Design a protein around this ligand. Structure first.
Ligand SMILES: [Ca+2]
Ligand SMILES: [Ca+2]
Ligand SMILES: [Ca+2]
Ligand SMILES: [Ca+2]
Ligand SMILES: [Zn+2]
Length: 316
């Protein structure tokens, strides 16, 4: 809508207060005009029809419990936009400042979130497996990163290509969590998963096998479930990424860590420059080595650590 940019205040899913960019025209709308062509947040009103209604509020104060998921979807999308701009010089998900749209209150008891090819969508959870999903910054950044991947490498959501697609979203979701920092960790979804149980998460990058996910190529899932294991086999790549950043010894192979900032640079370059829609794990390794080479030289410690990491998870 057309109007005057302003700033409102509200409370997110976890009860934390924050300022959000809104737009005023009779009502106050969740429309942030300060970032690219805008960040827009919609109410799906417990239906599955999308996008729903651009979120309108009478007084620019967002403290109702119904408001919480919208506040966080809207705010964390802004933080994710800032991460890509300030760190990777990328303007929105398409590189030309596309508007970012999210809908919350999707369906009833919906225990997931997703990028649907055009926008992000967030369920409220059923209140025991998940609380509203936009309350996790790693979840928001994971979904938005699917948009980035779709406009760059275009990794097919199937088999090894799909597992790389998912891993990339976990890696950047985590890097964005550390950017905002934020109680950052190497777990996925801990803030919104099982409000009844502390210390757990949906997936672990530091120890995928903690939740039954493979951490070595020999343990990859080869069946047909989950589009050929896209959320399962991502564990192999997440572990490699964790090792490149933080270092460690995994199955007898030692990796010297090079830290998060270089991990992000190497993987962003691999994604935007070298990966294609049908890339497999072995092609990922080649892309990552070539990226590190491009950036730090063929005899760098950085290239050596990338090679070490993939050797350790059994990817040749
Ligand atoms: Ca209000
Ligand atoms: Ca965390
Ligand atoms: Ca996390
Ligand atoms: Ca939990
Ligand atoms: Zn995903």
């Amino acid at each position: 809508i057309t109007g005057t940019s302003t700033v409102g205040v509200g409370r997110g899913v976890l009860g934390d207060q924050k300022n959000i960019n809104t737009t005023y025209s009779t009502y106050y709308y969740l429309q942030d005009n300060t970032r690219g062509n805008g960040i827009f947040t919609y109410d799906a009103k417990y239906r599955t029809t999308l996008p729903g209604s651009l979120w309108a509020d009478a007084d620019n104060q967002f403290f109702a419990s119904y408001d919480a998921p919208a506040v966080d979807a809207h705010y964390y999308a802004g933080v994710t936009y800032d991460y890509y701009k300030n760190v990777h010089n990328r303007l929105s998900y398409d590189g030309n400042n596309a508007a970012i749209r999210s809908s919350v209150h999707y369906s009833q008891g919906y225990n997931n979130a997703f990028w649907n090819g055009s926008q992000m969508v967030y369920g409220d959870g059923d209140g025991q497996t998940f609380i509203p999903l936009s309350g996790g910054i790693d979840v928001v950044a994971h979904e938005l990163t699917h948009a980035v991947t779709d406009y760059t490498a275009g990794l097919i959501y199937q088999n090894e290509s799909g597992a790389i697609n998912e891993a990339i979203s976990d890696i950047f979701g985590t890097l964005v969590e550390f950017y905002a920092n934020k109680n950052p960790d190497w777990e996925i979804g801990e803030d919104v998963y099982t409000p009844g149980i502390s210390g757990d998460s949906l997936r672990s990058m530091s120890d995928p096998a903690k939740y039954g996910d493979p951490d070595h190529y020999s343990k990859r899932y080869t069946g047909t479930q989950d589009n050929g294991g896209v959320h399962i086999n991502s564990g192999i790549i997440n572990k490699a990424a964790y090792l490149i950043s933080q270092g460690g010894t995994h199955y007898g192979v030692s990796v010297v860590g090079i830290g998060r900032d270089k991990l992000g640079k190497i993987f962003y370059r691999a994604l935007t420059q070298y990966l294609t829609p049908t890339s497999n794990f072995s092609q990922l390794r080649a892309a990552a080595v070539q990226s590190a080479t491009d950036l730090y030289g063929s005899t760098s410690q950085e290239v050596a650590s990338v090679k070490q990491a993939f050797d350790a998870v059994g990817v040749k």
